[PDB]
Design a protein around this nucleic acid. Structure first.
Ligand SMILES: [Mn+2]
Length: 176
DNA sequence: CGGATATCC
DNA sequence: CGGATATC
């Protein structure tokens, strides 16, 4: 897919927020805009985007196996490059051009960890995780872990997570 | 099967 | 000077 401007990316996502669904048990089930979070370079407000990244909050674990694998987009021509329960890479047609649209899923309990992870940028994640690794912790898009045990942080938002991990908060467009 | 090899932030 | 996913 080609690079997009920030405005083009936003236009695509606004189109998608009313047109995403999944096919399951003979039903075409709407993915609510409520549960669609822009992530990646779009959330970082980069002036040129590599692709469009969306995080879908799946509020029911047993549905993970059925959401991305049966993803449907009304009013859009697209093909699927790879597609599993957690990552689905699509190539969409938009105004005579092809763009990459990446879809990822998070469960409710994972949400702040997922937003933090998928926001990036990669260089920033590597430095943060390196520091935590030195203290025998592991951070990923699902949680914070010590000795392969989930560390039960009392947090709701990404901002709260960052503070709880002991790092300086920066808005998405200022992380590097 | 999955270890090997494309991929994501 | 990280960590996880998809395909076969
Ligand atoms: Mn992407």
């Amino acid at each position: 897919g080609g690079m997009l401007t920030l405005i083009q990316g936003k236009k695509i996502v606004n189109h998608l927020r009313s047109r995403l669904a999944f096919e399951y048990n003979g039903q075409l089930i709407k993915i609510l805009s409520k549960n669609i979070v822009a992530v990646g370079s779009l959330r970082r407000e980069e002036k040129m985007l590599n692709d469009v990244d969306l995080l879908i909050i799946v509020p029911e674990k047993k549905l993970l196996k059925h959401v991305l694998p049966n993803i449907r987009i009304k009013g859009l021509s697209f093909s699927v490059k790879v597609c599993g329960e957690r990552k689905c890479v699509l190539f969409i047609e938009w105004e005579k051009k092809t763009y990459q649209l990446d879809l990822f899923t998070a469960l409710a309990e994972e949400k702040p960890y997922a937003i933090f992870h998928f926001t990036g940028p990669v260089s920033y994640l590597i430095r943060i995780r390196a520091a935590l690794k030195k203290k025998n912790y592991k951070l990923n898009q699902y949680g914070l872990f010590k000795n392969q045990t989930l560390v039960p942080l009392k947090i709701t938002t990404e901002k709260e997570l960052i503070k709880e991990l002991g790092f300086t908060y920066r808005i998405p467009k200022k992380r590097l």
